[PDB]
Structure formats: C-alpha cells, structure tokens
A paper describes a structure:
Importin‐α is critical for successful nuclear import as it recognizes and binds to cargo proteins bearing a classical nuclear localization signal (NLS), which facilitates their transport from the cytoplasm into the nucleus. Importin‐α possesses an α‐solenoid tertiary structure characterized by a deep concave surface ideal for NLS‐cargo binding (Fournier et al. 2013). Notably, the twist causes the concave surface to become deeper at the N‐ and C‐termini, resulting in what is commonly known as the major (ARMs 2–4) and minor (ARMs 6–8) NLS‐binding grooves, respectively. In this study, we describe a combined computational and biophysical approach to design TAF8 NLS analogs, with zero net charge, and test their ability to target importin‐α.
To validate the computational modeling design, the analogs were co‐crystallized with importin‐α, and their structures were experimentally determined by X‐ray crystallography. The crystal structures of A1–A4 in complex with mImpα2 at resolutions ranging from 2.11 to 2.42 Å were determined. The electron densities of the 10 ARM domains of mImpα2 without the importin‐β‐binding (IBB)‐domain were clearly resolved including the P1–P6 and P′1–P′5 sites for the major and minor NLS‐binding grooves, respectively. The crystal structures had the same space groups as the original TAF8 NLS/importin‐α complex and every amino acid was resolved for all analogs bound at the major groove. Accordingly, the analogs bury an average surface area of 629.6 ± 21.2 Å2 in the major groove. Superpositioning the four analog structures at the major groove showed that the sequences also share almost identical binding modes, based on the alpha‐carbon's (Cα's) as the crystal structure of TAF8 NLS. The Cα backbone of the analogs exhibited RMSD values of 0.485, 0.529, 0.487, and 0.513 Å for A1, A2, A3, and A4, respectively, at the major groove. The analogs formed a total of 8–10 hydrogen bonds, 1 salt bridge, 37–40 VdW interactions, and 1–2 cation–π bonds. Visual inspection revealed that although the side chains for K299, K300, and K301 residues aligned at the P2, P3, and P4 sites, indicating that the analogs also relied on the consensus sequences for their binding, there were notable spatial orientational differences for some other residues and the amino acid contributions for A1–A4 changed significantly from the computational modeling. Crystal structures of these analogs complexed with mImpα2 confirmed their binding modes, albeit the novel interactions formed in the modeling procedure were disrupted by DTT used during crystallization.
Author numbering:
A (entry chain C): 1 to 9
B (entry chain A): 72 to 496
C (entry chain B): 1 to 5
Write the structure that this text describes.
C-alpha cells in the first residue's frame, strides 16, 4: 500500500 | 517503563553517553512511533533524532539498538514524503542495506521493511535504493531451495519490498533492475501464501503498466498461464492484481493479447463480468475492450467463449463506469469485426441497451455509442438491412434520443447524430 | 482499432 507502519511484534 | 515517554526524555537518554540508556530511549521512541493515534513523527524529526538512530543501525555489538532504531526509522519512513526524505537525508539507505546481511533475522526483516517504505515513496527514492545496491542483497535472502522454509512474515515483507522496487512510472524502474528481479518474482508467483501471491501479482501489474517492450519482458518469462490461474482464485486480494496485470498485457500487441487468450483467460470472464465487486467488473470490462480492439480471430474467440451476452449484460445493468468500458468494448468490436460478427452482436440484443445509454450525461460515452451505431449501420448497408436496423432503433426509443442529440453542445455528437438521421431516418 | 490505458 505504498507504505506500512509497523504497529507490534 | 519504556512506555509513554516524552520526546524530551527520549532525547536526554539518546544524548547520554550510555549505550544502555540510549537503547532504552530508542525503544521508548519506537513505542511512541508504534502507537495508532497520531504517532509524533514530526516531533521526533524536529528533536534531531534521525542521525542518532541511523548511527545506531551500525552498532553490530548492540543488536537490540539496531532493531529498535530500525523499527523507529521504519515508522518515520512510513509517513509523508517529507518524513521519508528525513530518513533518507540521515544516510539510512546504505545503513539499511548493510543490515540486510545481519545474522539476526528480525533485524534483516526490519531493514527490508524500511527499504520498502523508502522505495514506496516514489520513483526517485526507489531508484536511489537501487543505486545503493539493494537488489542483490534482497534477492540473496530468497536464494533458498524452497521458499516454504522461510518464515511467513519475512517472506511477505520481502515480497512487498520487491513489489515497491517494481512500482511507479515517470520513470519506470531501470530495465536491468527489472531483469534482475523478474526471475525471483516468477518464483514467488508460484508460492502458496495468499499475501505473497497478491504482492507478486501487484509487482507484475506494475511492470506491465507501460510500453509494449516492458510488457514483453514479463510475457517472455512465461508467467501469463500462472496469472490466468490466479485470475480464478477465490481471494479478491489476488484476483484484483492478477486482472490488472492481464488487462495491462492486452493493451500491448495482438501477439501479446493472444498469449492471454491461449492461456485460457476468456473462460474466467463469465464470473468476472458478473462479479459482485464493481472494480472487478469494471476492470474485466476494460480488459474485454482491449481484446475486442484486436484481430477478427480474437473477436471470434470472445464470441466462442459466450462473452457477447455478458457484454450485453454489463451494458444493460452495471455501475456507469463499467457501462462506459462496455460501450468501448462494443465500439471496438464493431470497428474491427466481420459483418457476421456484428450481426451476432445485434442478435444478442446490443441495440436496446446501447440506446438506453444515449440518455447519459457524459459526452464521451455518447460519442462512443454513436460511433458504434454507425459501424453497425455500415455492416447493415453491406447486407441491405439498413431499414430493419432503423426500425429496431426506433422501436426501442433510440430515434428520439438521436434526434435530441442533433441539438447537443458537443460538435462530434450533433454531427454524428445529424448524419445518422440524414442517412437512415 | 486501438487499445487504451
């Protein structure tokens, strides 16, 4: 989606 | 207690000369930037933290600060172009490419993700990522006998990043970079994970969105059969990109279009042209339009697969945008078809739905439909059936609409309308 | 005819 935030891991 | 820190506290930690204090503060920043509500990216940038995070990427001795800084920088790079630029301007690209070689998979993966965000901004950063030599190390991560041994998340991130290196135009990616990537993409198009398949299809869609030479590079890799298979998948996230790619390919040469036909694509179109998702119906109808723009033998395969009734269907009832693509498909069929093929189209019921669309408030569709009527009349002239056609048009309410159109703003419309009435009515 | 993107 063009760009992706990493929210959790 | 690396939760809910202030930026001031993060700065104080990062400016400490204590690697552990710096690590705690870097993790606090990561957690800030990982919150869903307005992550404070601009405050972090304004604090001057990007250069520090980038330097932490190079601390091989402290793997956790590498990870935390990588994730922090990933989330900044996820934002606006300006926010992505700040990461690039900090020297992150070469530092992330170095991290692709990390023995720690979680760090390699984060570097993959960050480079995807950077390449995803646009052509210029994509090309800068390529110039700094990202492709070789990225592909090396996928040089395994069986992709199924790789962790699911890792493989999905790599596929997504590679798709962003394939993306954007003006300009399109460098030809040599596309040649380097395509063999790995072909392999990922055969992987069994739905998300890998979707992102692989998106990549092919991007690489096929251009001149015939770009299409040829993909088509010569032999992927069209696999794309047609994916066109028949249950998952919409796969079908959407597969159909876009197929649609892109049929905008090329007639010989490239034939590969799609030979691969069995037209057998999926009954479903596609009746699909509940409007976008799929639109794009499938657009695809049909570029097949009806082909050779007469190609029009015949449309006929043989039973697809003219489906085009009558979409013309009769669909979202307006789909109906306009269908009008194009008819005008293209009528423009390039044999007399027998045009007769078939009328026997399938094209006239009434075409005439019903002449009531539309769109100049282009009226032009398209008027062109198609002319083409059909031209075939009727060759059969001496002009009057039968004239009657059909009159009986379904057409003559009324064409008459009105002689009195229409657009010149092409009134000219095309006046001519038809003058010659047939 | 001619194709279109």
């Amino acid at each position: 989606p063009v760009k992706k935030e990493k929210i959790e891991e | 207690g690396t939760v809910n820190w202030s930026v001031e506290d993060i700065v104080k930690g990062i400016n400490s000369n204590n690697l552990e204090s710096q690590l705690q503060a870097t993790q606090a920043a990561r957690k800030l930037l990982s919150r869903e509500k307005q992550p404070p990216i601009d405050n972090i940038i304004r604090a001057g933290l990007i250069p520090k995070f980038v330097s932490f990427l190079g601390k091989t001795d402290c793997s956790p600060i590498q990870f935390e800084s990588a994730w922090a920088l990933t989330n900044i790079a996820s934002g606006t172009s300006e926010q992505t630029k700040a990461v690039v301007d900090g020297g992150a690209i070469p530092a992330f490419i170095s991290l692709l070689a990390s023995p720690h998979a979680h760090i390699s993966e984060q570097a993959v993700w960050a480079l995807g965000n950077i390449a995803g901004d646009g052509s210029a950063f994509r090309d800068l990522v390529i110039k700094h030599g990202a492709i070789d190390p990225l592909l090396a991560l996928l040089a395994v006998p069986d992709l199924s041994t790789l962790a699911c998340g890792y493989l999905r991130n790599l596929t997504w990043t590679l798709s962003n290196l394939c993306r954007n135009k003006n300009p399109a990616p460098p030809l040599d970079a596309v040649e380097q990537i395509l063999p790995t993409l072909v392999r990922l198009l055969h992987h069994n994970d739905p998300e890998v398949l979707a992102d692989s299809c998106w990549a092919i869609s991007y690489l096929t969105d251009g001149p015939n030479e770009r299409i040829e590079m993909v088509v010569k890799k032999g992927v069209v059969p696999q794309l047609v298979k994916l066109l028949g998948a249950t998952e919409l996230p796969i079908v959407t990109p597969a159909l876009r790619a197929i649609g892109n390919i049929v905008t090329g040469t007639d010989e490239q279009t034939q590969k799609v036909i030979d691969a069995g694509a037209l057998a999926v179109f009954p479903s596609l042209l009746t699909n509940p998702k409007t976008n799929i119906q639109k794009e499938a109808t657009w695809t049909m339009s570029n097949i009806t723009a082909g050779r007469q033998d190609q029009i015949q395969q449309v006929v043989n697969h039973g697809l003219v009734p489906f085009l009558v269907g979409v013309l009769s009832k669909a979202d307006f945008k789909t109906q306009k693509e269908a009008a194009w498909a008819i005008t293209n069929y009528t423009s390039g078809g044999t007399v027998e093929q045009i007769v078939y189209l009328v026997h399938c019921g094209i006239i009434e739905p075409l005439m019903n669309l002449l009531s539309a408030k769109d100049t282009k569709i009226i032009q398209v439909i008027l062109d198609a009527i002319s083409n059909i009349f031209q075939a009727a002239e060759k059969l001496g059936e002009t009057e039968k056609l004239s009657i059909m048009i009159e009986e379904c309410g057409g003559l009324d609409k064409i008459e009105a159109l002689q009195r229409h703003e657009n010149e092409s419309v009134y000219k095309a309308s006046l001519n038809l009435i003058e010659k047939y009515f």
